[PDB]
Structures are given as structure tokens and as C-alpha cells.
Design a protein around this ligand. Structure first.
Ligand SMILES: *[C@@H]1O[C@H](CO)[C@@H](O[C@@H]2O[C@H](CO)[C@@H](O)[C@H](O)[C@H]2NC(C)=O)[C@H](O)[C@H]1NC(C)=O
Ligand SMILES: *[C@@H]1O[C@H](CO)[C@@H](O[C@@H]2O[C@H](CO)[C@@H](O)[C@H](O)[C@H]2NC(C)=O)[C@H](O)[C@H]1NC(C)=O
Ligand SMILES: *[C@@H]1O[C@H](CO)[C@@H](O[C@@H]2O[C@H](CO)[C@@H](O)[C@H](O)[C@H]2NC(C)=O)[C@H](O)[C@H]1NC(C)=O
Ligand SMILES: *[C@@H]1O[C@H](CO)[C@@H](O[C@@H]2O[C@H](CO)[C@@H](O)[C@H](O)[C@H]2NC(C)=O)[C@H](O)[C@H]1NC(C)=O
Ligand code: NAG
Ligand code: NAG
Ligand code: NAG
Ligand code: NAG
Ligand code: NAG
Ligand code: NAG
Ligand code: NAG
Ligand code: NAG
Lengths: 136, 407, 99, 99, 50
């Protein structure tokens, strides 16, 4: 209405502001944030790791990395077929296969990771078991 | 009366439901973001408080892992994924409402679809983590559990799965509650119709009643309400001059803003501790419920139970699982007697000065003739030495009635 | 100072009535009233069924009826003394009140 | 020994007891009365503390409702109130102490 | 007040566990005959009274 200035949500956090110069309403949104998780086999095995950025689209982390706008400074090797998108977040450092094995390291919504064969880290959709059919 | 008995002459097949919560939402919290948004001074002050933030993280991580353990325990009972035969003729019994439907993209039963449509329904450093098992995988587990118990009975829960036709399995299950086999073989069509109608009524009983899934609804509502309270607690003063760190620092002298910052820090830390303790207690309750659900899955779905009123009200026959959001639904099938009648009874029979007791049944009289019957379904027989034993002379027993026993 | 105690919804008489109904059902019907319509049966026959349910044939009860009834009566009789003399019997309920 | 067995020749009927708690006392609390008896200044100061008092009320109300649910679950098993016959002869068994 | 309420919540959870056990015992020892060892007394169960 022609007399308000701000926009307030249910929990009373501002989420819309009108520009004072020109009367235009702008929607605001917090900058991206979340946790960071590290997937590793034993240090007795090797020293390679994979990193999961939780609940973020892969393009945003790629852009922030390319413009050095991220807080934890790893800049893990990101070129090639190692950036994968999951419902849990952006997974960097493991390649996605289309086989199905038993779950080794749980990651997210039906995705696990393991150390296979040279050697590398892979991600796959977990297998519930061997299909069977009884002769009724 | 001391010489009168009642024996049923007809029965009934009934189906009831049971809803049990299994798991709740997994959340994680970041202390620095929640307490001290981006100010460096607040974080530096919070450093002189110890390990009050490692403990909250550890507690929430433990809750999150237990939430997946619960679902793994309830649903991953079986080891192999069983498939149902292409043809769906099972002696006249109809299972369409509970078996997966290929036309639906998600491969869910109609009743599972009804439940899914019925329940239904990033802050400041607060996140929500997805569960490890997607809904399709839980549906696949449920489908395997249903296919195993139709084509094999209860044998697949103790070793290799051995097939058997469905009417024979039902005959075994009648035999397991004290009713002979021939009752089912002589009332097959009627019993199948009763079962079909009982399954049919479930859709209406679930759909019309709104307050059926109150437990799952409350599970969702409490978790939403706690988070809303936690976020809206961020705008309280706790005795300070303002609720914004920037406005405190802008118009105050650095050795004087410490008091206000400390007050805000203490208030917010107390709020976090309250939230975590409440979460821990709720998690313990949910774990108890999930353990009960796992026991019911083992004992009512993979076998036949003799515990009274454990798998429904009546004499248990079998049960079927269905997957619901954050929980499970059980469909218990029981046997119920009906249409009783007066009778006169006696404890023993004297013949040639020899007492007689029935091997399996109770002596009964229709006013003129004496028979022997099984004590769950009226089916008189003729007294003979092939269904009685002697064991006694004629006189110690009280209320003995003498008649003729043939050979 | 601002602290109240609320009465329970069920009075003690209603709980006593529930207990009385549970006792009357299991004497004149056995276990049949917990699964459908209640079907009557004389008490010695119900006891014969219950002996049959633990691996002892029927005729034992019919030949030892009077002795078994006396044993049951005396066993019920001793309960009053065992409960009354011992003071620490209801420790659980006492602790519930005390806490 | 590998060829010897023991078999009982007489029995005994015994009665034991078991006590279990079911429900506890229901209480409610008023924040303003307890914390700030009647002073207006104290209540005004307490206003700047958030929803620390709605939560306590909700928790106590939940406990109070669960206390009634417990008693309802244990005792209201049956659906009808059964009556015992006027005569109390049950084959020689005596039930006077429990009826 | 907060200490009092937390203690009450824990005690209530314990009481609820006990009441669930009591309901199961009412169902299985009073409305039927039990085969579980030492559930409805020490010996071979016959019947129970509340
Ligand atoms: C046992 O009960 C069933 C169910 O009521 C009876 O079947 C009904 O019989 C009547 C009369 O023949 C029919 O009108 C109904 O349509 C039947 N019900 C169904 C669902 O088909 C059956 O007759 C009863 N058995 C005895 C011996 O009385
Ligand atoms: C099992 O029950 C379903 C539910 O009614 C039956 O589906 C019906 O099938 C007939 C054709 O025989 C259709 O005309 C109806 O419209 C269907 N009803 C619904 C709700 O879809 C099914 O036929 C039954 N199973 C068998 C083998 O007949
Ligand atoms: C089984 O035990 C009962 C109980 O001890 C025996 O009954 C007792 O018998 C003796 C001797 O006849 C009497 O002095 C007692 O008064 C009886 N007890 C009661 C309570 O009346 C019974 O004799 C035993 N049976 C056998 C075969 O030895
Ligand atoms: C059941 O036991 C009670 C308890 O003793 C019996 O009550 C006694 O009855 C006699 C009369 O037969 C009185 O002289 C006693 O004083 C009573 N005792 C008490 C403690 O009240 C009762 O008689 C027994 N049942 C039957 C049917 O005899
Ligand atoms: C403020 O100045 C700009 C500069 O041209 C003008 O376009 C705008 O209309 C002015 N705002 C108002 C409210 O007049
Ligand atoms: C990520 O962003 C692109 C474009 O910004 C969008 O097309 C894509 O759907 C996003 N990822 C997901 C999982 O939605
Ligand atoms: C894996 O194989 C499937 C065929 O079922 C194919 O659709 C998919 O693209 C493959 N994954 C690859 C090539 O990464
Ligand atoms: C019990 O049986 C006797 C005969 O043995 C009979 O006279 C009496 O009426 C019966 N009791 C009842 C309540 O019918
Ligand atoms: C059994 O006998 C009682 C006593 O006469 C009577 O009230 C009852 O109706 C009878 N049962 C049936 C099914 O008629
Ligand atoms: C009892 O059953 C016999 C069966 O042989 C029958 O002849 C008789 O008429 C029946 N009596 C009554 C009262 O129904
Ligand atoms: C058969 O029973 C009647 C009545 O109980 C009894 O009078 C008669 O003596 C009995 N028969 C014999 C051979 O004792
Ligand atoms: C076991 O049986 C053998 C004969 O089969 C006998 O010699 C031996 O003494 C028995 N063992 C014991 C401990 O009595």
C-alpha cells in the first residue's frame, strides 16, 4: 500500500523493502550457508578425500569458488567428472557410477560412497538386495 | 448356572488398523551463526565459555543417527526382494487395494496413496537433513514383505521361502486357533467374500474420519512449533538495551557494550539448551515406539501370535503392513464368534461303571440326545471310544451323567 | 503461591466398578468375553480347561476338586496377613506420593 | 545320570501379588503469581524475556492429559458392565474377599 | 521453575512405561492364560485377578 516501507514475515524477519529513491519493492534473500562434511576411507588406506556441501546447488559453489567468495579455502580439484548433484548437496571429488552395491558410507537420499578400483572414490545408488521371485 | 453352556454357531472376519510413529525430523544447529550472527566481538566473547557448543553438536548428531537406525530396524527385516506372480488369483481373495499399482508413477498401493495425501502437512543457522532411505525404498521393502507372506506364509521369516497355495495357508491358520480344517474348506467362498468386504470398508473408515492420523500429525506439529519458537526467541532483549548487535555496538563504548553482549549471549545459550533437552526427551519416546513397531512387525507379520489383544481384538489370523509418512500402519485380520445358543453340559459319562472324558471337545446335550463338540463352533458328533478316554471308575466325579458309548 | 492440583477425571468409585466388571466377566465366562460375546461355562469346567492348558489331563481336577478348592481358599486367606503385617509392601505407591 | 528321571506325584496351588504404579498427581503453575506476586514492575520486567512461560504451561498440560490417558488405557478394557449372580456358589471356590 | 518442570517430565516418562506394562499384564494375564515364563507369577500360570 502507498504508505508502507517494509515487509515482515511470520517470525518477524524483514523480507521485502521499498527503494526510497524510486518507489519499487525488492525481495531479499540471505546469502548461502550450510555445513561441510568430509568423506574419507581410513588413513591406513589412502589420503584422498571427498567434500560435501550440504543443501546447495552446484552452480553457486562453482561461481563462488571461481570468484573466491567461500569461507573454507580448499579449492579441491574440480575439473572433469567429479562434481555431482544430490538432494543432500553438491558432492566434489567422487565420480558417479550406475551400478549398485551394498551401502558403505551413507551420504544422503539413497546415495552411498566407497573406495573401489586405478583406485578412486565412487558414488552410487544403494542396492536393497538381490531380487527374488517364488514360483507360486 | 452350573450345568449350562453356550457355543457359537457362526463367525465373522474383521479388519482393524493401528498407527505407530517410527522416526522424526533430523536437524542441526550452528552456535556461532545463531548466537553471534557475523560480529567478531561476540564470537571472541563467546570463546570464554568452554565446550557448551561441542556438546550440543554431539547430542544432535546422536539423535540424527538414531533416527536412521529406527527406520532400518523396522523395515529392513527381510534379506531378499520378493516379487509377486503376474497373475493375481489367490483362491478368491482380493489383494488389489494393498498391492503396488503399476499405473501410478511411484508404485504405491491405493491405501498408501490415501495416507500420503492425507497426512502431508533456512532460518538462522538451522538446517534439516534428509533421511537416508527415500520413500520409494520404503515402499519396496513393504512390497517385498507383502509378497513374501502371500506366496509362502510364515516360512520365509525363518529360512528359505517355501511356497504353498493360499487356501492351505488359511487352513493352517484356522488350525492354529482351535478350529478344525474342514470349516474353511466348506466355507471358502463365504469367508473370501467377508474378507473382501472388510478390506473394502477400510478406505471409507480411514478417509471419512479426519482425526485418524493424529499421532503422525502431532509428530510433525511439535517439530514445527519448536523451531518456530527457537527462531522467534531471537528478538528478545533479556534485560539489554536492544536486540540487535549492530545497534548495540554503534551507539556504545566498547568496554560498555560487553554487559549487553553478555546478557544476550546468556539468554540465547539458555534457549538453545532448552531446545536440545526437549529434543532428547522426545527422541527417547520415539525410540520406544519404534521398538514396539519392530516387535509387532516380527510377531504379527512374520508369524501368528497367541498373545491376547497384541495383533488386534479377536483371535489373530494375519496382518499386513503399509508405509505412512514417519510411521507405519498395520491391518490386523481376526476371527470373531457369533450367534450363540443355550446348551446343557456334563463333565463325564458313566458306561458300565467306567467314567469317560472327551479327548478334544465338550459333552453337550440338545435336550434328548448327547453329543461331543469342539468348543469354538457347533458341530455335534456321536460319542464313541475313538474320541474319549476312561481314567476313573464312576463315583469320584461330581455331576457325572450316564449314557451309552458305542464302538 | 500459584500452584494448583487438579482432580482426576475418573473417581475411585468408577475405577472400582471397572474392576468389579472385570472380575465378574472372568468368573462366569472364562476368557471368552475378551474376544467377542461372553459365553457362560461352569467354573470347574473352566478350571479343567486351564489345567489342560499346562500339560495336565482333565481327570486330575475332577478327582481332586475338593482338595484343590481348599488349597485355593487357604492361599487366598493368607494374603490378608501377608499384606497387612508387612509394612514395606506398597513402597512403590508410597514413593510415588512422596516424590 | 543318563538313565534316571524324576517325576512329581503331588502339586500345590499358590497365590502371589504384584504392585505397579499407573498415574501420578496433576499440577499446574502460574508464572506471574509465582515469580512476581502482585508487583506491576516485576511483570513489566518479565515481559522482556520471551515465551519462557507458554512452554512450561504446554508441558504441564501435556503431562496432565497423559495422566488420564494412562488410567483410561489400563482399566477401561471391557465394553459392558457385567453383574455377578445373586448366589455365590462356584463349585466350592470362595471369592468373598475379592468381590 | 525450569528445573522442576524437567524433573516432572522425566518422572512422567517413567510412569508411562510402567502403565504400558500394567496394560499388557491386564490383557494377557486376566483376559487369557499366558505361556511366557515368569510373566504372570512364578510357576505355571492358571489365572489372575485385579
Ligand atoms: C452365518 O452368517 C452369514 C453372514 O450373515 C450368513 O450368510 C447370510 O445368509 C443369509 C441367509 O441365507 C443371506 O441373506 C445373506 O446374504 C448371507 N450373507 C452373505 C454375506 O452372503 C450365513 O447364512 C450364516 N450361517 C448360518 C448357518 O446361519
Ligand atoms: C478386487 O477389487 C477391486 C475393487 O473393486 C475390483 O476392481 C473392480 O473391477 C471391476 C471389473 O471386474 C471394475 O468394473 C470396477 O470398476 C473395479 N473397481 C475399482 C474400484 O477399480 C477388482 O476387479 C477385484 N479383483 C478381481 C480379480 O475381480
Ligand atoms: C498331596 O498333598 C496334600 C497336601 O499336603 C495331601 O493332603 C494331606 O494329607 C494328609 C494325610 O492324609 C492330611 O493329614 C492333610 O490334612 C492333607 N492336607 C490337607 C490340606 O487336607 C495329600 O494326601 C497328598 N497326596 C498324596 C497322594 O500324597
Ligand atoms: C468364604 O470365606 C469367608 C471368610 O471366612 C467366610 O466367612 C465366614 O462365614 C462364617 C459362616 O459360614 C462365619 O462364621 C465367619 O465369621 C465368616 N468369616 C469372616 C472372616 O467373615 C465365608 O463363609 C466363606 N464362604 C462360604 C460360602 O462359606
Ligand atoms: C529522485 O531523483 C531522480 C533523479 O532523476 C528522479 O528520477 C526521481 O523521480 C526522484 N524521486 C522522486 C520521488 O521524485
Ligand atoms: C541449479 O541452478 C540451475 C540454474 O541456476 C537450475 O537449472 C537447477 O535446477 C538448479 N539445481 C536444482 C537441483 O534445482
Ligand atoms: C548407466 O547406465 C544407464 C543404463 O541403464 C544409463 O542410462 C546411464 O546414463 C549410465 N550412467 C552413466 C553413463 O553415467
Ligand atoms: C447347582 O447344581 C445343583 C445340583 O447339583 C442345583 O440344585 C443348583 O440349582 C445349581 N445352582 C444353580 C445356581 O443353578
Ligand atoms: C442362554 O440362556 C439364557 C438364560 O435363559 C438366556 O437369557 C439367553 O438368551 C440364552 N442364549 C440365547 C442365545 O438365547
Ligand atoms: C436332538 O437331536 C436329535 C438328533 O438325533 C433329534 O432327533 C432330536 O429331535 C433333537 N431334539 C431337539 C429338542 O431338538
Ligand atoms: C445312572 O444314573 C442314574 C441317575 O444319576 C442313577 O440313579 C443310576 O444308578 C445310574 N446307573 C447305575 C448303573 O448306577
Ligand atoms: C552313561 O551310560 C553308560 C551306559 O550306556 C554307563 O556305563 C555310564 O555309567 C553312564 N554315565 C553315568 C554318569 O552314569
Amino acid at each position: 500500500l502507498p504508505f508502507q516501507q517494509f515487509g515482515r514475515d511470520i517470525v518477524d524477519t524483514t523480507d521485502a523493502v521499498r527503494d526510497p529513491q524510486t518507489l519499487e519493492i525488492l525481495d531479499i534473500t540471505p546469502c548461502s550457508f550450510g555445513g561441510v562434511s568430509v568423506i574419507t576411507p581410513g588413513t591406513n588406506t589412502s589420503n584422498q578425500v571427498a567434500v560435501l556441501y550440504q543443501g546447495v546447488n552446484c552452480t553457486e559453489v562453482s561461481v563462488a569458488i571461481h570468484a573466491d567468495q567461500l569461507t573454507p579455502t580448499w579449492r579441491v580439484y574440480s575439473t572433469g567428472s567429479n562434481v555431482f548433484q544430490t538432494r543432500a548437496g553438491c558432492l566434489i571429488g567422487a565420480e558417479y557410477v550406475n551400478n549398485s552395491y551394498e551401502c558403505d558410507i551413507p551420504i544422503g537420499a539413497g546415495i552411498c560412497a566407497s573406495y573401489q578400483t586405478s583406485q578412486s572414490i565412487i558414488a552410487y545408488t544403494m542396492s536393497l538386495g538381490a531380487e527374488n521371485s517364488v514360483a507360486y | 448356572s452350573n450345568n449350562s453352556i453356550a457355543i457359537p454357531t457362526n463367525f465373522t472376519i474383521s479388519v482393524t488398523t493401528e498407527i505407530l510413529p517410527v522416526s522424526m525430523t533430523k536437524t542441526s544447529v550452528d552456535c556461532t551463526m545463531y548466537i553471534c550472527g557475523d560480529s567478531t566481538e561476540c564470537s571472541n566473547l563467546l570463546l570464554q565459555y568452554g565446550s557448551f557448543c561441542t556438546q550440543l553438536k554431539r547430542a544432535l548428531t546422536g539423535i540424527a543417527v538414531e533416527q536412521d537406525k529406527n527406520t532400518q530396524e523396522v523395515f529392513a527385516q527381510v534379506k531378499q526382494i520378493y516379487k509377486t506372480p503376474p497373475i493375481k488369483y489367490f483362491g478368491g481373495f482380493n489383494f488389489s487395494q494393498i498391492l503396488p499399482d503399476p499405473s501410478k508413477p511411484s508404485k504405491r498401493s491405493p491405501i498408501e496413496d490415501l495416507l500420503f495425501n492425507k497426512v502431508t502437512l533456512k532460518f538462522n543457522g538451522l538446517t534439516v537433513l534428509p533421511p537416508l532411505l527415500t520413500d520409494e525404498m520404503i515402499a519396496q521393502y513393504t512390497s517385498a514383505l507383502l509378497a513374501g507372506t502371500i506366496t509362502s506364509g510364515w516360512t520365509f521369516g525363518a529360512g528359505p521361502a517355501l511356497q504353498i497355495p493360499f487356501p492351505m495357508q488359511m487352513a493352517y491358520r484356522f488350525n492354529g486357533i482351535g478350529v478344525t480344517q474342514n470349516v474353511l474348506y466348506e466355507n471358502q467362498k463365504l469367508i473370501a467374500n467377508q474378507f473382501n468386504s472388510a478390506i473394502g470398508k477400510i478406505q471409507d473408515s480411514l478417509f471419512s474420519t479426519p482425526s485418524a492420523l493424529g499421532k503422525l500429525q502431532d509428530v510433525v506439529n511439535h517439530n514445527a512449533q519448536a523451531l518456530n519458537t527457537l527462531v522467534k526467541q531471537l528478538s528478545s532483549k533479556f534485560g539489554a538495551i536492544s536486540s540487535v548487535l549492530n545497534d548495540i555496538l554503534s551507539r556504545l563504548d566498547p568496554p560498555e557494550a560487553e554487559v549487553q553482549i553478555d546478557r544476550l549471549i546468556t539468554g540465547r545459550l539458555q534457549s538453545l539448551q532448552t531446545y536440545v533437552t526437549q529434543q532428547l526427551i522426545r527422541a527417547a519416546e520415539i525410540r520406544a515406539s519404534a521398538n514396539l513397531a519392530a516387535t509387532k512387525m516380527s510377531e504379527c507379520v512374520l508369524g501368528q501370535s497367541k498373545r491376547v489383544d497384541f495383533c488386534g481384538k479377536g483371535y489373530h489370523l494375519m496382518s499386513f503392513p503399509q508405509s505412512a509418512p514417519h510411521g507405519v500402519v498395520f491391518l490386523h485380520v481376526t476371527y470373531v464368534p457369533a450367534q450363540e445358543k443355550n446348551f446343557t453340559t456334563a463333565p463325564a459319562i458313566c458306561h458300565d461303571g467306567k467314567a469317560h472324558f472327551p479327548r478334544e471337545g465338550v459333552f453337550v446335550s440338545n435336550g434328548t440326545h448327547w453329543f461331543v463338540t469342539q468348543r469354538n463352533f457347533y458341530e455335534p458328533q456321536i460319542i464313541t471310544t475313538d474320541n474319549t478316554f476312561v481314567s476313573g471308575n464312576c463315583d469320584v466325579v461330581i455331576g457325572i451323567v450316564n449314557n451309552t458309548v458305542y464302538d
